[PDB]
Amino acid sequence: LPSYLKPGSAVEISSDEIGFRGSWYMGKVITIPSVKCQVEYTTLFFDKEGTKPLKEVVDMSQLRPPAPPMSEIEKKKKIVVGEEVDAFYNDGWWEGDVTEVLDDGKFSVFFRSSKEQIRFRKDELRFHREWVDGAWK
């Protein structure tokens, strides 16, 4: 079993339910056994009242480790038109292109799955990484 799937460990969570395309939501593994585990989302809940954190059985292929801590130079390089990024939106990371860089530290970001175009502050974005074959790209 992969190191990062140990119960208790932080993860990010993909989905192929339509309307979660391009998202990675943060959570934790609850139960390892089939090719499937159960997680607990850190920011979603079963209920508006938010008393019961959401829990769900997924495939292990919908899971990936937390994104790597950006180095200090990486953590402060410039963001440019066309960079792929993840914006923090509906309490989740969503992937989009940067289409405009604005004079006040702000960016405008195009989402292809949802035809959406939304402004964000720099501290609401992260650099989009992919997690293939065990390594961060």
């Binding site: 339910e17 339509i18 309307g19 979660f20 395309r21 939501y25 920011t43 979603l44 809940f45 079963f46 209920d47 508006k48 009242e49 938010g50 959401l54 509906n90 309490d91 989740g92 799955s113 949802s114 959406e116």
Partner: peptide, 11 residues
Amino acid sequence: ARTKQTARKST
């Protein structure tokens, strides 16, 4: 307060 319902983008 955020649920799958108030987070999804479609259907």
